[PDB]
């Protein structure tokens, strides 16, 4: 099994435009949305068919109730933060919690908050402490760290529960998440050489250019890995041609344990 992760994100907005939810919560397994909830629908619903097919209505009903509670808690926290920052207008509050199960069997776990899209509080589940970025966060840090049982609960959830959920969802979604679609790769000239890959899954891929057998990362332009819309991905990388000297240029692509080289004649 390659590396996989489970994450849940919350977004709260303090003064949203009409119709826009003040609260959204979305779960992911790897890059795949699995769940969604917001303050308009007030319902938690599957976002992947293999979640809908494997989790009974009592699962969605229970987490709907919990997310209604978490929505109210988030509004209270954001109200507190914006009053203590002495900020007017609309501001955002975000949370991310999750875990990774690495290919070698090791695990990671993480929990953090952001205000206006910047790190605000970051959990360290080994030292059982919160890292505060400023004095508003520092007041919250002190209150949360005075509740030792809740820190322990969060460490246990990140290390044990989260990973158990991830393995459960990974088996539900195995036909999607554990498949491999290899890339179709081509080179063309636009004066730079463009190495272009598409049709691949999972999205993790590494493309680079080597010149005479050496990799000069500073001379390479790396395109983003982008969703093609059909469940597969595409990516590219370019390198500039030297018109003064001949060189052997080759594109190198690594994807899901297979390496590919296309030499430019």
């Amino acid at each position, epitope marked *: 099994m390659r590396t996989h992760s489970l994450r849940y994100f919350h977004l709260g907005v303090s003064d949203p435009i009409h119709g826009v939810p003040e609260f959204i919560s979305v779960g992911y397994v790897d890059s795949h949305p699995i769940t969604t909830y917001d303050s308009v629908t007030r319902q938690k619903e599957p976002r992947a068919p293999w979640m809908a097919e494997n989790l009974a209505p009592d699962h969605w009903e229970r987490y709907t*109730q919990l997310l*209604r509670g978490w929505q109210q*808690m988030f509004k209270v926290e954001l109200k507190r933060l914006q009053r203590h920052y002495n900020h007017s207008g609309s501001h955002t509050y975000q949370r991310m919690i999750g875990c990774e199960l690495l290919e070698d069997g090791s695990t990671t776990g993480f929990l953090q908050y952001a205000y206006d899209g910047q790190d605000f509080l970051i959990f360290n589940k080994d030292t059982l402490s919160w890292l505060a970025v400023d004095n508003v966060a520092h007041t919250i840090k002190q209150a949360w760290e005075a509740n030792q049982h809740e820190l322990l*609960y*969060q460490k*246990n*959830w990140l290390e*044990e*529960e989260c990973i158990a959920w991830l393995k459960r969802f990974l088996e539900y979604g195995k036909d999607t998440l554990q498949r491999t679609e290899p890339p179709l790769v081509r080179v063309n000239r636009k004066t730079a050489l463009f190495c272009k890959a598409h049709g691949f899954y999972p999205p993790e891929i590494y493309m680079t250019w080597m010149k005479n057998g050496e990799e000069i990362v500073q001379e390479i332009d790396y395109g983003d890995i982008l969703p093609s819309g059909d469940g597969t991905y595409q990516a590219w990388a370019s390198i500039e041609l030297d018109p003064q000297s001949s060189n052997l240029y080759s594109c190198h692509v690594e994807h899901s344990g297979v390496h590919m080289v296309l030499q430019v004649p």
Partner: antibody, heavy 108, light 116 residues
């Protein structure tokens, strides 16, 4: 899913007693002990979620996650410790499963 | 600073009679619960209210309904009492639902006996 604890225990004033709770659950988000005097409300005693022992006055609570086991340890028993002791486990959906309680009887 | 206040302490009912149990908490808690306690078994949740403005069934909801009137109050209704509803009822509340380690605060109990 189930939680088990003995129906009743009897011990002598001044002695020590260990009340056992074992549990089989889908997932685990911590174990609580509550005290309930006869005719009265349950009151919170302790919470464990990682392995080990936590002390609180004359009471300590222990947890082994791999054995699915906890005990509530009462030292220097007093007559006022006569009460029921309720174990409860929070499962993977953050719902409590309650044991049926252990009635502790203290001989003066 | 009253904690959890539930009424009544005692009630006898005839089969088919209606009854409302009241519960209020002044601790600014978000989550409230109605439990029944019977001999030989653990507490069983009847209905709960994760926060103001939402409620849902627990493990034994049949024969009962609830109203989360506001943040402080969570009432339990037996529209048509039955002898199996003879029990001791406990209201409880917690700071919220997301506090994994958070404990319950219990009311004093309501002892109901339903007779033919």
């Amino acid at each position: 899913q189930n939680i088990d604890q003995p129906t009743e225990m009897t011990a002598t004033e001044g002695a020590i007693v260990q009340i056992n709770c074992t549990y089989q659950t889908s997932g685990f988000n911590g174990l609580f002990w509550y005290q309930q005097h006869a005719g009265e409300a349950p009151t919170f005693l302790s919470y464990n979620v990682l392995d080990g022992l936590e002390e609180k006055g004359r009471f300590s609570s222990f947890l082994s996650r791999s054995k699915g086991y906890s005990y509530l340890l009462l030292k220097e028993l007093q007559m006022k410790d006569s009460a029921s002791y309720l174990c409860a486990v929070k499962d993977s959906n953050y719902q409590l499963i309650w044991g049926a309680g252990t009635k502790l009887i203290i001989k003066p | 600073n009253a904690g959890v206040t539930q009424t009544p302490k005692f009630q006898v009912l005839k089969t088919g009679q209606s009854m409302t149990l009241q519960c209020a908490q002044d601790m600014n808690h978000n989550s409230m619960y109605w439990y029944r306690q019977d001999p030989g078994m653990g507490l069983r949740l009847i209905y709960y209210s994760a926060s103001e403005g939402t409620t849902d069934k627990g493990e034994v909801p049949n024969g009962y309904n609830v109203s989360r009137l506001n943040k402080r109050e969570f009432s339990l209704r037996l529209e048509s009492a039955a002898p199996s509803q003879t029990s001791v009822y406990f209201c409880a509340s917690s700071v919220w639902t997301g506090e994994g380690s958070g404990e319950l605060f219990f009311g004093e109990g309501s002892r109901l006996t339903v007779l033919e």
